[PDB]
Design a protein around this ligand. Sequence first.
Ligand SMILES: Cc1ncsc1-c1ccc(CNC(=O)[C@@H]2C[C@@H](O)CN2C(=O)[C@@H](NC(=O)CCCCN2CCN([C@H]3CC[C@H](Nc4ncc5ccc(=O)n(C(C)C)c5n4)CC3)CC2)C(C)(C)C)cc1
Ligand SMILES: Cc1ncsc1-c1ccc(CNC(=O)[C@@H]2C[C@@H](O)CN2C(=O)[C@@H](NC(=O)CCCCN2CCN([C@H]3CC[C@H](Nc4ncc5ccc(=O)n(C(C)C)c5n4)CC3)CC2)C(C)(C)C)cc1
Lengths: 78, 78, 379, 379, 6, 6, 147, 147
Amino acid sequence: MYVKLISHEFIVKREHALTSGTIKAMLSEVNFIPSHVLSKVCMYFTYKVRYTNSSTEIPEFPIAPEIALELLMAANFL
Amino acid sequence: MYVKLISHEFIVKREHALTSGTIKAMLSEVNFIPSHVLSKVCMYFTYKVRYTNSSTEIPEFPIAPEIALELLMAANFL
Amino acid sequence: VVIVGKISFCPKDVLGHGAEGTIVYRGMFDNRDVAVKRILPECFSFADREVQLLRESDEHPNVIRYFCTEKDRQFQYIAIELCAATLQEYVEQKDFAHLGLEPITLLQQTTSGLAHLHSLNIVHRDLKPHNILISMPNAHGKIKAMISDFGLCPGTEGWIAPEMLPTYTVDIFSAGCVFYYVISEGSHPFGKSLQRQANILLGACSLDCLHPEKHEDVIARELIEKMIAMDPQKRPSAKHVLKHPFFWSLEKQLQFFQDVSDRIEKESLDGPIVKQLERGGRAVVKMDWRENITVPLQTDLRKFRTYKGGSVRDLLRAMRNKKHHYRELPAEVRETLGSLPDDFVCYFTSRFPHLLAHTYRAMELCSHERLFQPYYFHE
Amino acid sequence: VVIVGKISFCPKDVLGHGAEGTIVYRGMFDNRDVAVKRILPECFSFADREVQLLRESDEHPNVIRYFCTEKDRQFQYIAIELCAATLQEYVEQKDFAHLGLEPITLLQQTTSGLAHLHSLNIVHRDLKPHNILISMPNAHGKIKAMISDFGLCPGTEGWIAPEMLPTYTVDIFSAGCVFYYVISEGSHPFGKSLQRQANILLGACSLDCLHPEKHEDVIARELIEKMIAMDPQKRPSAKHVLKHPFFWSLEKQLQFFQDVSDRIEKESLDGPIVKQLERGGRAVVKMDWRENITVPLQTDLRKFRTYKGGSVRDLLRAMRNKKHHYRELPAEVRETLGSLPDDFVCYFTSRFPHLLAHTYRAMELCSHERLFQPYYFHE
Amino acid sequence: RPQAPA
Amino acid sequence: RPQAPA
Amino acid sequence: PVLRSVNSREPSQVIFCNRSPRVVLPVWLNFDGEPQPYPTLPPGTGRRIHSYRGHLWLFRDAGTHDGLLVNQTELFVPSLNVDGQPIFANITLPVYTLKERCLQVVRSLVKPENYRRLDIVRSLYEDLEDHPNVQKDLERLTQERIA
Amino acid sequence: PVLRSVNSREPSQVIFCNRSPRVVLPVWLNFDGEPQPYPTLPPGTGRRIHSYRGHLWLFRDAGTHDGLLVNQTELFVPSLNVDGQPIFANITLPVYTLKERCLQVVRSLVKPENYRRLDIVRSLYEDLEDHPNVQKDLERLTQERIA
Ligand SMILES: Cc1ncsc1-c1ccc(CNC(=O)[C@@H]2C[C@@H](O)CN2C(=O)[C@@H](NC(=O)CCCCN2CCN([C@H]3CC[C@H](Nc4ncc5ccc(=O)n(C(C)C)c5n4)CC3)CC2)C(C)(C)C)cc1
Ligand SMILES: Cc1ncsc1-c1ccc(CNC(=O)[C@@H]2C[C@@H](O)CN2C(=O)[C@@H](NC(=O)CCCCN2CCN([C@H]3CC[C@H](Nc4ncc5ccc(=O)n(C(C)C)c5n4)CC3)CC2)C(C)(C)C)cc1
């Protein structure tokens, strides 16, 4: 299944959105977190599902300095 | 007084020719020693009188390698 | 191979580690085999204080020898004497090729190097079997113990003096633990490694490896117990430790016994010397010492039946007489006593294991005398 | 200032010279004060054998310490321990600041370094007061003698063994000359410098500075005379020299005397021990020793009138008795004899200057005994 | 890329 | 020059 | 400690292959379990390494001491050189939790003296001062192992 | 020996001024009279030198050890620094006897192993092997001095 997140609107798979314990509690549509930070969370979900238990080497998840604090706060909440 | 030496003919002062003990015994005209070695002896007499008790620094008396042995023999005899 | 000047080494030839990232390699300096400590930039300040202590210390046979120091663009390098093992490897790997080095000679060398540092006003502050190195054999095959990593070159688990958790007494405490460590072949005065510092604060001082009825263990407990004393002021200096009976040869033990019995021969029985020598004397001589010697020596001692068995002084003067008259003694007696001096003194110490330890402490009140200078330390 | 790497020096700071153009400078190596020997290209082969002997020798306190060697485009440089003086400057300039170093301790240190070289199969081959260096004082103000320029690093006037004009005996000969040199404060066993080698071949061995009636000079002549023996096979090894009474303290001289008198107390008067001890005995005890001691000691010796004055053994056992009974002696007697051990033994040696030298040699026939191990050398 | 989708 | 006259 | 190297003295060759974009610090637990830092490995590079069977290696960031995986595992143990091949130790980045990854970014940008001045939840200051610690992870790995 | 340096220990500054076309070897007779070679002086150059009053210096060719004059004298003795000036030591070539000058030329051109093969009077072989010797000149200068 697919689920909808709101900051802007984002749609991700439920197997990806389950990477968040908080979203896995709310889902068992969610509106929050600015779009520029919630899209970065949607990019982390794709990064996590792609590279968890991957046989390849794994690339550093890139984080911009200006979003570091906003994204840390969101990640600590999620 | 001046004295005459013969190998060619050379004329030197008696105060210069006295630098040779042998010539100072013969003189108290002398014929010998090739000219190319006896002229070098005449050059040594001028060198000796000029630089004996000289206040200046003294230059190395130059001797050619090809005459070294002929001039050593003449000097040992003189 | 890496060259930093006179110093060179193979990066694959690691000997071991120090503190804060410093690897030690087997290197080469001026055609000598050396150990090369590589120092990270964050430790350049500490490696300078180490080099200064290494070079400015007077040379001592039992202190690690320092050769040179180089600076690369990244690291510092220190060339020091290449050794064969640590004291920890000696104790825990007995299969190490230890040519003739004996545990008490090892400890004597360690205390000699330590007393040398203390005389230079240098506190090691980190003495432990890992910092004590066993040398490569010299041209005569002789092996010695040396002290490295001294003067801070705390934190170390299980070797810190209680009051440090700057004065030489903190080194005497850890030396006392090293002593017991070597003597017991691996044990620690304060337990296993995890409970060790918690036992140092509580004051365990459990020395159960030292038998209370063996002469050598009674002497070794007398020294170790006051080296690891909780009160720092009760700890002997390193020059006091070196004068202890623990380091005496059998010949020096028998000479002490002769000197004591001569000192007390013409002495009043009510005088302080004999009085202190007889406190607890009944326990030392095992009530009656005349019955504890063997029958062959008893037979010749029955020739002078006047000896009293409760007196320590009578055991001393009896033991002294058989030493002076040894060559006149019957062969049947000389065979029990054994050869002078080693076998002769072992005869009496092994039967009266507290005789040396009691007499030594009982004769401290005349340690100032010229006769007793070799046995006691005073400054 | 000249830098050749770790070594650096000021060209104006000349300490002195060596052989074949080698100037020694006061330099600096790894922040240590060093002496820097500059070697001309014609001596690079010799400076290599010197460095090899310096580094590959076991470290000894009385051997010069070697640090590094550098090569410039023109010269070699050797960094070695910087000393304060030579033994020649010590002897000939007494005004040198010699803190506490004593001539016999100086000689003992020189023989210790020499016996160390000989144990490494190294022959110095050039030992003389110029090659023996007096150290800079350490952190305790102590000064020692060290040996440099050894192993050829012959020719030297007045110090060569006769048979060299390869074996350790050539060093014992020149050491014997060094001994006399130091003892006599400048004289030589074979005369002034020009007549010296001509006297070494002829065998002068004139030791006139040593008085034949002083105890110390009798002992020093006994050692020196056989170190400079013309026959090389009659010369003692360096370990024999170190065991000689010449290096004994007053306490060890009195202990030897006690050990001898105890060894001979229960001994047959016709036995080889007492017989050899009594050959020439009348000269040692000055015919009757009972009359040569002072009247106060005579008074207490008259309490046991039985002593015979022609016997060396009676002088020994009498001297031994007053040592054992010293604390019982009247103050009027203890004041003449003096304090044990130094003043007590000086009392007898100064009145019988041949007593120690005679007894020592007379007791060689029992040097193999365990009792006499500290006094004689045997291998 | 998963961490930087197009 | 005396040692090399002209 | 339970996590320690065995003193096997059987040499094993190992390729420390740094497949992460970080400078790797090889950390060797000695025979007492104490961690000893070895020379760092530049990103992308691999090195032939002399080790011994049963020795324990864990790999950290050389700057931040962030835990790194080796063969998808916290700890690496050299096996015998079967067929003469050198054992490969692929040091790789683990997928960090988004919190921890953001914590590493903040730790690099912000010095410790400024963590408690950031306009964030106060409990994040304690999480920021909780720098990656090898000794802390040795306690955790011991607990996980003995269970 | 009679020719020796006195151990005065009074420092004197000296200009070793090499006014000869040869490399000069400064030779210092120590307090025992033994000659000690010092660093050589290139031709034309002068050096400020630390010496002491009453010390004995003689100067040789550095290659052939030919005797050289200093202030028109075989031997040089530093005086006290009167008015603070450094004493000048003008090292110069002496007028050699024509025999000796030719002997130096032959000695350089002909190696010792070939002296006795030259077609010259046999007594010249002994004069050629009579190389300039500092120790020989110290005996001669002592004899000349004590006279
Ligand atoms: C390039 C690179 N990039 C990323 S990683 C890397 C890398 C990878 C590997 C290497 C080289 N390979 C290793 O390092 C491997 C890795 C790991 O498997 C452990 N390992 C070892 O070799 C270790 N060996 C063993 O386990 C074999 C058992 C044998 C133990 N041996 C017995 C002898 N014992 C000593 C002998 C030398 C004596 N000399 C002496 N002398 C004077 C002083 C003065 C000061 C000082 O602090 N010290 C000492 C206290 C340090 C002195 N020590 C001291 C006693 C102890 C060592 C051990 C580390 C224990 C050697 C190098 C670099
Ligand atoms: C550039 C140049 N171009 C042409 S010429 C030139 C030039 C000209 C001058 C200089 C410098 N100026 C000099 O050299 C002048 C020239 C001439 O006037 C003599 N002169 C001196 O300075 C001499 N001084 C005196 O007469 C003053 C009396 C004081 C004597 N002092 C007492 C202390 N004594 C020593 C102290 C150091 C100790 N250290 C030690 N340690 C370890 C070892 C290991 C090996 C070894 O072989 N050694 C020793 C045996 C060498 C060691 N030694 C040894 C004892 C002896 C020296 C004296 C030469 C005697 C110093 C330099 C170059």
